[PDB]
Design a binder for these strands. Structure first.
Ligand SMILES: Nc1nc2c(ncn2[C@@H]2O[C@H](COP(=O)(O)OP(=O)(O)CP(=O)(O)O)[C@@H](O)[C@H]2O)c(=O)[nH]1
Ligand SMILES: [Mg+2]
Ligand SMILES: [Mg+2]
Ligand SMILES: [Mg+2]
Ligand SMILES: [Mg+2]
Ligand SMILES: [Mg+2]
Ligand SMILES: [Mg+2]
Ligand SMILES: [Mg+2]
Ligand SMILES: [Mg+2]
Ligand SMILES: [Mg+2]
Ligand SMILES: [Mg+2]
Ligand SMILES: [Mg+2]
Ligand SMILES: [Mg+2]
Ligand SMILES: [Mg+2]
Ligand SMILES: [Mg+2]
Ligand SMILES: [Mg+2]
Ligand SMILES: [Mg+2]
Ligand SMILES: [Mg+2]
Ligand SMILES: [Mg+2]
Ligand SMILES: [Mg+2]
Ligand SMILES: [Mg+2]
Ligand SMILES: [Mg+2]
Ligand SMILES: [Mg+2]
Ligand SMILES: [Mg+2]
Ligand SMILES: [Mg+2]
Ligand SMILES: [Mg+2]
Ligand SMILES: [Mg+2]
Ligand SMILES: [Mg+2]
Ligand SMILES: [Mg+2]
Ligand SMILES: [Mg+2]
Ligand SMILES: [Mg+2]
Ligand SMILES: [Mg+2]
Ligand SMILES: [Mg+2]
Ligand SMILES: [Mg+2]
Ligand SMILES: [Mg+2]
Ligand SMILES: [Mg+2]
Ligand SMILES: [Mg+2]
Ligand SMILES: [Mg+2]
Ligand SMILES: [Mg+2]
Ligand SMILES: [Mg+2]
Ligand SMILES: [Mg+2]
Ligand SMILES: [Mg+2]
Ligand SMILES: [Mg+2]
Ligand SMILES: [Mg+2]
Ligand SMILES: [Mg+2]
Ligand SMILES: [Mg+2]
Ligand SMILES: [Mg+2]
Ligand SMILES: [Mg+2]
Ligand SMILES: [Mg+2]
Ligand SMILES: [Mg+2]
Ligand SMILES: [Mg+2]
Ligand SMILES: [Mg+2]
Ligand SMILES: [Mg+2]
Ligand SMILES: [Mg+2]
Ligand SMILES: [Mg+2]
Ligand SMILES: [Mg+2]
Ligand SMILES: [Mg+2]
Ligand SMILES: [Mg+2]
Ligand SMILES: [Mg+2]
Ligand SMILES: [Mg+2]
Ligand SMILES: [Mg+2]
Ligand SMILES: [Mg+2]
Ligand SMILES: [Mg+2]
Ligand SMILES: [Mg+2]
Ligand SMILES: [Mg+2]
Ligand SMILES: [Mg+2]
Ligand SMILES: [Mg+2]
Ligand SMILES: [Mg+2]
Ligand SMILES: [Mg+2]
Ligand SMILES: [Mg+2]
Ligand SMILES: [Mg+2]
Ligand SMILES: [Mg+2]
Ligand SMILES: [Mg+2]
Ligand SMILES: [Mg+2]
Ligand SMILES: [Mg+2]
Ligand SMILES: [Mg+2]
Ligand SMILES: [Mg+2]
Ligand SMILES: [Mg+2]
Ligand SMILES: [Mg+2]
Ligand SMILES: [Mg+2]
Ligand SMILES: [Mg+2]
Ligand SMILES: [Mg+2]
Ligand SMILES: [Mg+2]
Ligand SMILES: [Mg+2]
Ligand SMILES: [Mg+2]
Ligand SMILES: [Mg+2]
Ligand SMILES: [Mg+2]
Ligand SMILES: [Mg+2]
Ligand SMILES: [Mg+2]
Lengths: 76, 135, 417
RNA sequence: CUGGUAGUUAUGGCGAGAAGGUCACACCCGUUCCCAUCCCGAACACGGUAGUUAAGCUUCUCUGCGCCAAUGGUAGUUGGGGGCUUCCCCCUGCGAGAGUAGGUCGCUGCCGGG
RNA sequence: UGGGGCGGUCGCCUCCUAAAGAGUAACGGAGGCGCCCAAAGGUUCCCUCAGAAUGGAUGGAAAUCAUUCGCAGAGUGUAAAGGCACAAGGGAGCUUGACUGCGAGACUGACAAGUCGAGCAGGGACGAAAGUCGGGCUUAGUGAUCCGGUGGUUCCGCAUGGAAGGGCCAUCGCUCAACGGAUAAAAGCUACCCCGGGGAUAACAGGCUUAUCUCCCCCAAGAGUCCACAUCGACGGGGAGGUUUGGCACCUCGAUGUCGGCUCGUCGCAUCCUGGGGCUGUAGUCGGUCCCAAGGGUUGGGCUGUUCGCCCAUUAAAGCGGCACG
RNA sequence: UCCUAAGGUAGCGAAAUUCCUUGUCGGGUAAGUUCCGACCCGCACGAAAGGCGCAACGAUCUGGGCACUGUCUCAACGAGAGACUCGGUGAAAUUAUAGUACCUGUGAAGAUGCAGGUUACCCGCGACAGGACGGAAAGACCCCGUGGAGCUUUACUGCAACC
RNA sequence: AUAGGCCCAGGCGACUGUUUAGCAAAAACACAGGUCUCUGCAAAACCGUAAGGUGACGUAUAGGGGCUGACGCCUGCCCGGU
RNA sequence: GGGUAGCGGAGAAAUUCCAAUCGAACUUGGAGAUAGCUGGUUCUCUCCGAAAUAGCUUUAGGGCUAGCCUCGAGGUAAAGAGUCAUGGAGGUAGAGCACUGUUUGGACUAGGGUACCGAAUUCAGAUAAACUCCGAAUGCCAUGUACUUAUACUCGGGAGUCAGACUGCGAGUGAUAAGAUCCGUAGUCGAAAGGGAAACAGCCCAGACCACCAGUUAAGGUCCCCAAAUAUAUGUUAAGUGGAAAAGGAUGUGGGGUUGCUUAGACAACCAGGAUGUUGGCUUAGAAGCAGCCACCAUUGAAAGAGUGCGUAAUAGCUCACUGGUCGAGUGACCCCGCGCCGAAAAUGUACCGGGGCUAAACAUAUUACCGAAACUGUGGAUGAACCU
């Protein structure tokens, strides 16, 4: 006559935050994730909780590394 | 009656039955089979009744195949209980059959008793069927 | 296979251990397995909890350490006992009546039996509506001077509902009883003797009937059920027997009985024992290889008296006499038979026993059938035991024995020596 | 011809068979020192070439596994319109998965020797 | 809160629902948290798992040994998801960056809060060096303000010098768990009850639905002395009705009187009697079942508030339902 | 033999107390869910919240019988007071305006007033109560309001009083 | 004209009496009787801030409070908890 | 005639009485107590025009910030909208067994004591919201020099709203019920009149500034009520189907395909024949084709069965298969499709086309005219904004 469920967390707003070809300011976030779905490429670093940010001003370019992986790069 | 030995989750969605059958739309094991023309849920009780009436006429001569199995389970509520306060407890097991799916097979008997045995089976199922043969 | 306990108290019974073992067998019949047998020797059943204040704790502990779900009691419990036990043991409870109703509800393979089981179950569950509805009656909306809310009380409404849905099945069963005698019309119009069998479960009644049918019936393919499970046969079957001397009677089998059968179900079997109610010869198949056979036999007589079978010629037939070592079968003493219903000597023995009992007015009388008039030679061959026949120039000479009806039906053809 | 060192979605891999070599590269010998093993100079480390292509390595052949891959058709579906509405049908645009014709025993850059 | 009460829940993390960006509800389907680690953190160097077969053993199916095969079928302190074998998994040497002041720019977001961050200065650990280090593979392991305690201080100190006291930085005291916390401090009965509201919300009646209920059928195993279909018909399947038990909460709370009986009836037919007919396990009498048929008719008492029911005595028969359960 | 401070004694017992329940047997009746007498299986009797009896008393509650009767089968007649016609005097509750039919349907899901049909010349008098969800009383039942009041206690905080 | 109907059996309360003016006349209250307990006199109890009073112009065979309710037969076990 | 007065008095005790008022009298004052609750709020025209959501709350019919409306003022690397080209992140529909659960039928039993397995290998075939070796259509983010089009943003003044409803599509709970409940997405109502659905907020067409005895169209229609086709061409239905409802049953009817036989005579009828060993054996009182089981022959002949159904207790007798003749034009067997039939029962009165009525005035395909709105156009007026002179 009762239910033991009814609990859920708070959504973490994951996913991409900048688009391909868009000029981006240094220090800005590009992709929020758990683990490493996308690897940091050129001028991109991965933070403590695996958020890829940009080190220098440039243009975001999502691009394909070896057969089963992806990376994001920033080009001046 | 055909029930799963164990299940990962006791509760499942009702689902849907739109489109053609994904696979099993042809006869492969025997030489005659019942083919569904419409789509409906088939409980395990209707599978049993349509099988006893199907082997009894054959006098236990020849092999039959059951091409469906009741994987999904369904729940129900008692009379006198208002809506809410969770989900109902499971009652039975069903097999959603989309149109174009073979449900039975016959081999090892002549033409005359194969069609008649399938005819008695079809009257115990809630779908419109058709007797189909191999090639 | 569900895991259950088995509990019972002596309460001045004369058959405590046998009834306990019978409850064990009944539980094993319902795809239910036992994991403990608690027996108490208290004189009077406790008014509140069937067993007692202290025994409840022992039952609870044994079921807790034995991994059991349901507890099967040995006698029907009043609603207060049901509530107290189900609330203290924090599990479910079930008595003999509920168990045997569940057994019958699963073995019924006809409309009449199903309707009878349903009416008996509904009557059983009629007294427990108070405890069924007390939980919702503590919170039945409450209030006071509604000035617009109905005119009755919740409990009384529930009683009205259940009585309304019970008299309908009562009427349906009355109609079914009236129907059942249309098929009996042809047997009634033609006075034909019938031999009906009663006894206790697994006494061999069906095996006896099958042996006789295979021995004499023309339609030998027509057989009867035969299995070791409790209550294999739940419906009566009539068969027509033709002894080699051209004699005709019918032989019927009935459902078996068990000890302390609920009184609700005997009311339902009042109909199913109509065939034995109006019979000519009874056979009471008593097992002779089970030491409580005296108890089972007597129980059969009390059940029969409850149904209303009396003033009936009874022939006792002890079965399974092969198992007993160094015994003389087939035999006959008074009106008692020792035999096993799996041999070609016991069966034929019982056949001439029935021949002695039923047909005893078949006096012999010579006949002189006119030679031209046929159709009487044939009639006096399939309805008599022709001793000798002779041929003359003025007709044909027949000597045989016929029923006293035929002595006046064909009185003119007889000729005195 | 070979030894290093990079790029390139395994069409670059796996497996199978053959040829070759002190000019390289390896296998190999020994443990004095630098260093080394939860014990073991097996590896690591050091000192050399008595012996060797049987291994690693290079070249050659394959479709056996793997990998890559059309065309046509089909499921699905945005927009519009119909029905007998567990669902189903018609017009236009997009268009798989599986299966298949087919390809594959790699392609480029730099440096040192023979 | 599919009326209220009893029951259950109240904050945080993970998955599905969630309709291929993000977000998205229900007393919808599954689980965890209120910690732990002085190495389970940093750095340098090194290597690789589960399982199986084979021969020998005290020692057995499974303890330790050798070989072979072995893309993860293991492991990752703990739940799940995402991820990792150019380790984020496993060993050993040295250590305390589980540092101080900060911080361009972004994510999330009503606010309060929460998250990521290149880079600069001070002074260090590891490493030959390039370099890495502001706790742990990532995401939970926590509660504001007011008020008090402890340590420090180049701040103020009610005429002046002090002091009492306060300020600033660091830190401690909450199952304030109803977890954005009303107060430092809190349980029940009302049928003796009263006021302001509501058909936003229950009890009677209407409405939608038809699980349940009543009735009618399909297949035919069987019963019926042989005999599926005179009469019944299991295991299964399909409908009609809106009289039952239910679900919803659409009209009525500035009042829609609520059981049974009395008087008065009227309508439907799924017919209790009477009328006509087909089949019969219809010889006759008595019956059974089905088709047409609503013209008329359809009892008096004992017990109970009783509807119903049981019983006594009759009758051609003692019908079933609708009309706000007329 | 275990625990407890101790384990319900006498007397009653389907009771003003028994859910099951119309318990079971006997009486009364043609037929008795009530009544009377027994049984004890006391859900949940029990000794000053007194237990079991008890003559007299009761506008007390319950079951039965004699006499009596219009209570009834089943109604009939008669008398007086209203009603009814005439002369005098003459209110009230209610009221959006009204030339204010029936049926089937529709609609905030129950229509004199909407749609389609069927009926119906204009105005009154004596009667009956099916509808106007008829009149009267801002529902008491139910829920709500961080409304109220009376009462209780081992709820919080207090005061009188007493030691 | 005016002027008791009676009888058999049971529950409750012993009896006469009192009660919800205006819905309940009772099986409810009271009652004579039983028992426990407090009180030595400026008594205990009660009204009043006090003075002053009732108790009482009484004295324990007297006065206040709690429970039971004629009369008959009886009134069992437990002092751990309050 | 007197005594006891409301934080009080009386009470043979019922919340009983204290001036028709008592779970706490009446009167005046604090007092215009407080009411997150219900009711009420008065002249006109012009321009714009919502919400019924998120978060927190002793909070749920209240409030605060944000979201949505209106008025005023600013600044330009013109930033808003639509389409096109190009680049991306994301695992739904579908599908699949490469992992994990569920599961069918075979070969398969190293070892336990041969599934009873601890079981495993392999072949073939299924299944999944919490499975994925794969994977769209749409949607979303951005760049452009593209074409078109009018908004965006910031600051400030003023609000209202936080009960939503139905319909189409995708899901959950429910029973793959509800005019049910809870979300996402689009529309309409709310706040929308007009025309069609008989009547009928949410369905279909379509947005009313005013006047006109002007015209063209949309949904829907053109026999009468009621404006416009008793229109054209080719077919179907006989059920008032059209204008209500299934499993299942059937020589209803129309259209295609596959085929046997036949003027060296097809089917149907009429005439004749239809027999012998022989009553085959066994079982039976009785079994002669026809109670039951066993092989079911040869003979006359072109045909006749060791007999297809009646019948006798049983013989008898009746009849058929087959053959010959008689007359002379077609007949027998399956599959596919369209429209129809039965299954079909309720309460005041036909009552399941609005009515009349219809054999087309019904249905299918195609074609042409007309009617039809406050829509659009024509004529004449009134008015708001922006931009010009
Ligand atoms: N030893 C023995 N066994 C017998 C004898 N008769 C029957 N049995 C066995 O006992 C079993 C019981 O079956 P049976 O008695 O025929 O069934 P039943 O008694 O008719 C069941 P019900 O009585 O409920 O209809 C049978 O399987 C049979 O093998 C006998 O005389 N001796
Ligand atoms: Mg989450
Ligand atoms: Mg880290
Ligand atoms: Mg961290
Ligand atoms: Mg690759
Ligand atoms: Mg109440
Ligand atoms: Mg039997
Ligand atoms: Mg050389
Ligand atoms: Mg040395
Ligand atoms: Mg393609
Ligand atoms: Mg492809
Ligand atoms: Mg999406
Ligand atoms: Mg998302
Ligand atoms: Mg939990
Ligand atoms: Mg404070
Ligand atoms: Mg100073
Ligand atoms: Mg100073
Ligand atoms: Mg809160
Ligand atoms: Mg009120
Ligand atoms: Mg409502
Ligand atoms: Mg209702
Ligand atoms: Mg109503
Ligand atoms: Mg009103
Ligand atoms: Mg009829
Ligand atoms: Mg008749
Ligand atoms: Mg008849
Ligand atoms: Mg009639
Ligand atoms: Mg009487
Ligand atoms: Mg009703
Ligand atoms: Mg009524
Ligand atoms: Mg009684
Ligand atoms: Mg009584
Ligand atoms: Mg009595
Ligand atoms: Mg005492
Ligand atoms: Mg008492
Ligand atoms: Mg006492
Ligand atoms: Mg007494
Ligand atoms: Mg007395
Ligand atoms: Mg008068
Ligand atoms: Mg007058
Ligand atoms: Mg309606
Ligand atoms: Mg109406
Ligand atoms: Mg009208
Ligand atoms: Mg009048
Ligand atoms: Mg009106
Ligand atoms: Mg009214
Ligand atoms: Mg009100
Ligand atoms: Mg109060
Ligand atoms: Mg009395
Ligand atoms: Mg008295
Ligand atoms: Mg008196
Ligand atoms: Mg009164
Ligand atoms: Mg009175
Ligand atoms: Mg004095
Ligand atoms: Mg008393
Ligand atoms: Mg007393
Ligand atoms: Mg004490
Ligand atoms: Mg003491
Ligand atoms: Mg007083
Ligand atoms: Mg009062
Ligand atoms: Mg009271
Ligand atoms: Mg008084
Ligand atoms: Mg008064
Ligand atoms: Mg004031
Ligand atoms: Mg207030
Ligand atoms: Mg506008
Ligand atoms: Mg509101
Ligand atoms: Mg605002
Ligand atoms: Mg694109
Ligand atoms: Mg799918
Ligand atoms: Mg503003
Ligand atoms: Mg909100
Ligand atoms: Mg809301
Ligand atoms: Mg909504
Ligand atoms: Mg709906
Ligand atoms: Mg709704
Ligand atoms: Mg709602
Ligand atoms: Mg609009
Ligand atoms: Mg509004
Ligand atoms: Mg409109
Ligand atoms: Mg309109
Ligand atoms: Mg309509
Ligand atoms: Mg209109
Ligand atoms: Mg306009
Ligand atoms: Mg026109
Ligand atoms: Mg016209
Ligand atoms: Mg009618
Ligand atoms: Mg216009
Ligand atoms: Mg103009």
């Amino acid at each position: 006559g009762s239910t033991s469920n009814g609990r859920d967390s708070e959504s973490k707003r994951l996913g991409a935050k900048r688009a391909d070809g868009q000029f981006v300011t240094g220090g800005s976030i590009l992709y929020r994730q758990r683990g490493t779905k996308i690897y940091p490429g050129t001028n991109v670093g991965r933070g403590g909780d695996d958020t890829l940010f940009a080190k220098t001003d440039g243009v975001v370019r999502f691009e394909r590394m070896g057969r089963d992986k992806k990376k994001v790069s920033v080009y001046p | 009656m055909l029930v799963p030995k164990r299940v990962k989750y006791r509760r499942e969605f009702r689902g849907n039955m739109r489109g053609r059958a994904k696979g099993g739309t042809e006869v492969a094991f025997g030489e005659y089979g019942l083919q569904a023309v419409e789509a409906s849920w088939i409980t395990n009780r209707q599978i049993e009744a349509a099988r006893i009436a199907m082997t009894r006429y054959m006098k236990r001569g020849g092999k039959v195949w059951i091409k469906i199995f009741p994987h999904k389970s369904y729940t129900s509520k008692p009379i006198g209980v208002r809506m809410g306060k969770g989900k109902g407890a499971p009652e039975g097991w069903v097999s959603p059959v989309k149109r174009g799916k073979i449900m039975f097979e016959i081999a090892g008997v002549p033409e005359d008793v194969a069609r008649e045995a399938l005819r008695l089976a079809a009257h115990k199922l809630p779908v419109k069927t058709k007797i189909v043969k191999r090639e | 296979e569900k895991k259950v306990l088995i509990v019972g108290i002596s309460q001045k019974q004369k058959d405590f251990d046998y009834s306990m073992e019978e409850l064990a067998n009944l539980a094993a019949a319902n795809n239910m397995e036992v994991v403990g047998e608690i027996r108490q020797n208290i004189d009077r059943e406790n008014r509140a909890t069937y067993v007692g204040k202290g025994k409840v704790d022992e039952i609870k502990g044994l079921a807790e350490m034995q991994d059991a779900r349901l507890i099967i009691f040995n006698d029907e419990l009043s609603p207060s006992q049901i509530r107290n036990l189900e609330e203290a043991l924090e599990l479910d409870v079930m008595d003999r009546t509920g168990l045997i109703l569940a057994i019958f509800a699963n073995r019924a393979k006809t409309k009449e039996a199903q309707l009878q089981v349903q009416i008996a179950k509904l009557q059983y569950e009629l007294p427990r509506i108070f405890g069924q509805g007390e939980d919702m009656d503590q919170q039945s909306g409450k209030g006071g001077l509604s000035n617009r809310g109905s005119g009755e009380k919740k409990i009384e409404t529930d009683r009205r509902t259940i009585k309304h849905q019970i008299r309908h099945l009562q009427k349906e069963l009355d109609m079914l009883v009236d129907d059942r005698e249309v098929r009996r019309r042809k047997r009634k119009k033609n006075e034909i003797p019938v031999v009906s069998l009663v006894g206790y479960t697994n006494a061999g009644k069906s095996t006896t009937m099958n042996g006789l049918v295979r021995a004499y019936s023309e339609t030998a393919d027509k057989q009867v059920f035969e299995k070791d499970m409790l209550f294999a046969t739940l419906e009566t079957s009539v068969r027509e027997i033709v002894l080699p001397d051209n004699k005709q009677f019918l032989l019927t089998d009935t459902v078996g009985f068990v000890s302390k059968l609920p009184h609700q179900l005997v009311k339902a079997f009042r109909s199913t024992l109509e065939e034995a109610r109006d019979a000519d010869l009874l056979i009471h198949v008593v097992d002779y290889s089970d030491p409580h056979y005296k108890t089972m036999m007597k129980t059969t007589e009390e059940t029969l008296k409850v149904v209303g079978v009396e003033d009936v010629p009874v022939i006792y037939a002890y079965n399974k006499a092969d198992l007993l070592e160094d015994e003389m079968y087939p035999k006959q003493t008074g009106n008692t038979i020792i035999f096993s219903a799996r041999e070609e000597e016991s069966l034929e023995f019982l056949t001439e026993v029935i021949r002695k009992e039923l047909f005893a007015s078949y006096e012999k009388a010579t006949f002189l059938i006119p030679f031209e008039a046929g159709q009487v030679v044939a009639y006096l061959n399939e309805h008599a035991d022709i001793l000798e026949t002779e041929y003359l120039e003025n007709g044909t000479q027949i000597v045989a024995e016929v029923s006293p009806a035929d002595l006046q039906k064909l009185a003119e053809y007889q000729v005195a020596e």
